[PDB]
């Protein structure tokens, strides 16, 4: 609602750079959402603007009223150069937002391979949990991103994380009927004997006899 929202949203480069070089108050202006020009500039996809802000050394630990750091939000945007500059500065790779989802869940949600390799390369937890007790393989394996699963296999990601209901990534792969992904995770160590609060094995969660061929992938 402020000026830095339209200058940082509607595509103002020289008016915003002149606004920063003219008065630092506009550069450090916060709105009712507890956001700075970095949040709106990452919202509009401004590369050079956040390169100037991160160049001058803007505090990246600035969060909103919920706890959303620009690495969770901009990593939830799936932009290449934005995450290259944020990880170039070295932001908190394992900070907690309102729901607890680390930026790995957001790099895995948007199927961003380079953002996942660069987040997991800088020291991010490959098996971090949110408030819902779920990791990035529940959602990454549930959405249907096989290459994201493979690059999680590059970083030694666990396959038997218990959800808040008790489900595993194999339960979120059989519920979505991901054949090749459930065969891969089962061929990597997914236990077909883990039961959730519904008292149902992954053999009973899958449809069309897929738990029988997953058991075939267990015994063979």
């Amino acid at each position: 609602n402020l000026m830095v929202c339209n200058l940082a949203y509607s595509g103002k480069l020289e008016e915003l750079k002149e606004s920063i070089l003219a008065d630092k108050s506009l550069a450090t202006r916060t709105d009712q959402d507890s956001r700075t020009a970095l949040h709106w500039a990452c919202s509009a996809g401004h590369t050079e603007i956040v390169e100037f802000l991160l160049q001058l050394g803007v505090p990246v630990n600035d969060k909103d009223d919920a706890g959303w750091s620009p690495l969770h939000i901009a990593a939830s945007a799936g932009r290449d150069e934005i995450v290259k500059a944020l990880l170039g500065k070295g932001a908190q790779v394992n900070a907690v937002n309102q729901n607890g989802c680390t930026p790995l869940h957001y790099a895995a949600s948007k199927n961003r391979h380079e953002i996942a390799v660069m987040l997991l390369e800088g020291g991010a937890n490959p098996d971090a949990k949110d408030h819902y007790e779920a990791t990035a393989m529940h959602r990454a394996a549930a959405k249907g991103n096989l290459k994201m699963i493979h690059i999680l296999l590059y970083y030694k990601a666990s396959t038997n994380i218990q959800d808040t209901e008790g489900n595993t990534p194999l339960h979120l792969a059989c519920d979505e009927e991901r054949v090749e992904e459930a065969k891969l995770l089962v061929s990597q160590g997914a236990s077909i004997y883990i039961e959730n609060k519904e008292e149902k094995t992954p053999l009973q969660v899958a449809k069309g006899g897929l738990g029988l061929i997953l058991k075939r992938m267990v015994e063979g």
């Binding site: 609602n1 969770h72 989802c101």
Partner: protein, 236 residues
């Protein structure tokens, strides 16, 4: 997705618009039953069918022929069936047969019995009109208890599609089709907003997104965020 997939396979394959069916008889069926315990459902499905199949659609409510003249039924099957077999193959949306599928005996409120005797009339008409007709009448409901064995006879309703409670597929793809047109944010995330409906049951997720648009058109915030998604979840 899977429901529109079974309906689509059960509709467009018999309606391939070839004259060779008239020689060897109408083998494939024409009636498809549906389900769905959200807010009466059965609307955005026919909306997507209207997006894909740019043809005629007889949009009628389930309680449209309850007029005291009792002649609206035969006039709609006569005129609508004759313009379907005569003009072009259409999709007649005769939905909500649960209110008109309940047994009734007393002649005081026996209007439902009279219109189910009209359902017997057209029930025999559709048997007499099994050959040489380009008609596709869909008929769905959302209750499996007030049904009668007459409608469940083979050759009339040959498909029985069920609907799951969370049904994460239609939820994810309805989020994709609601975010493909309306505005969105980078903070907007669907992970817990499609995983939580798997744990807790609900309805009208699209209308909940529209409620989030109502809480976002307040002009106090420029871009919708997740607080209106979760707040719209806890309110409605």
């Amino acid at each position: 997705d899977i429901q529109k997939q079974e309906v689509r396979e059960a509709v467009e394959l018999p309606l391939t618009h070839f004259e060779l069916y008239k020689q060897i008889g109408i083998d494939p069926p024409r009636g498809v039953l549906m389900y769905g315990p959200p807010g009466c459902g059965k609307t955005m499905l026919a909306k997507a069918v209207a997006h894909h199949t740019t043809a005629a659609f007889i949009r009628v409510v389930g309680s449209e022929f309850v007029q005291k003249y009792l002649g609206e039924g035969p006039r709609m099957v006569r005129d609508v069936f004759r313009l379907a077999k005569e003009n072009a193959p259409a999709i007649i949306f005769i939905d909500e047969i649960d209110a008109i599928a309940t047994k009734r005996f007393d002649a005081q409120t026996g209007a439902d019995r009279e219109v189910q005797r009209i359902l017997l009339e057209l029930l025999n008409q559709m048997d007499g009109f099994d050959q040489n007709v380009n008609v596709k009448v869909i008929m769905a409901t959302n209750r499996a208890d007030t049904l009668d064995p007459a409608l469940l006879r083979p050759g009339r309703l040959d498909r029985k599609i069920e609907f799951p409670l969370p049904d994460r597929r239609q939820k994810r793809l309805i989020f994709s089709t609601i975010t493909s047109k309306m505005n969105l944010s980078e903070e907007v995330d669907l992970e817990d907003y499609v995983a939580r409906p798997d744990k807790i049951s609900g309805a009208d997720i699209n209308s909940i997104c529209q409620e989030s648009g109502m809480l976002a058109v307040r002009e106090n915030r420029y871009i919708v965020l997740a607080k209106d998604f979760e707040k719209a979840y806890k309110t409605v």
